[PDB]
């Protein structure tokens, strides 16, 4: 076995960030992140992804964000917005959270075991109590209201 035919030893995928409605507006405020969350597998993958964050209203971690537990009713009730195409979690632990945007439904998944570029059916199911509204295949949200 002294030949060693061709293989791919490394791949790079590059994308375009996230389509967003120009006319609906942006509003963002950065919150501190939770150190108890493995933030690595939430910012993994080159593909576009957005996900919901919830804030601790009290306790020793008050004002920190963590990804929204759709099975926990208090994590659903404490949503504050989405993170869009997340940042360097290694060099910084304060993520910019977007509170008002309009994003297509194909770019939002909660599960790590959820395929990229598909609508997450758990977000569509919980969309009334997540204060989301689906209009023409797009989530409309604003958490300042």
């Amino acid at each position: 076995d002294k030949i060693q035919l061709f293989r791919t030893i490394g791949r790079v995928q590059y994308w375009e960030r996230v389509p967003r409605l120009h006319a609906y507006g942006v509003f963002a405020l950065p919150f501190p992140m939770d150190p108890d969350v493995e933030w690595g597998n939430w910012f993994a993958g080159p593909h576009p992804k957005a996900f919901l964050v919830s804030v601790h209203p009290s306790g020793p971690k008050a004002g920190h964000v963590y990804p929204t537990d759709l099975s926990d009713p208090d994590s659903v009730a404490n949503v504050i917005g989405m993170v869009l195409d997340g940042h360097d979690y290694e060099a910084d632990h304060n993520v910019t959270v977007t509170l008002r945007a309009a994003v297509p439904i194909e770019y939002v998944q909660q599960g790590i075991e959820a395929p990229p570029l598909q609508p997450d059916p758990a977000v569509l199911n919980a969309a009334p109590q997540l204060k989301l509204k689906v209009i023409k295949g797009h989530y409309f949200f604003d958490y300042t209201r």
Binding site: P30, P32, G63, A91, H93, N94
Partner: protein, 102 residues
């Protein structure tokens, strides 16, 4: 590795005070906001110089940038503990120089 910090701030003047304030002794025909903006414009240049010297002195004094949530001029509640490499910043001296023992 190395990567910076970010800080900015804003200020807005509403519609009442732009033409409903003059001086307090005499009578003035609504031109004092052009004097009060130019101060607050100059003031914000001093804010960024005052922020630089704080972070600069925080290294020179402790070698440790710390920014806590409950803090002056951190309304946004952020978290930064930036440790530099300053080794043994305090010199040991148990009897200072003016102990005057005896």
């Amino acid at each position: 590795t190395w990567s910076p910090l970010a800080f900015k701030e804003s200020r807005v003047w509403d519609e009442k005070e732009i033409l409903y304030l003059g001086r307090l002794a005499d009578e003035v025909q609504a031109g004092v906001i052009n004097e009060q903006i130019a101060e607050s414009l100059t003031w914000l240049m001093a804010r960024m110089r005052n922020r630089r010297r704080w972070l600069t002195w925080q290294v020179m004094r402790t070698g440790r940038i710390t920014i806590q949530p409950n803090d002056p001029y951190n309304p946004n509640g952020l978290k930064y503990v930036i440790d530099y490499g300053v080794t043994d910043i305090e010199l040991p001296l148990p009897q200072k120089f003016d102990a005057k023992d005896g």
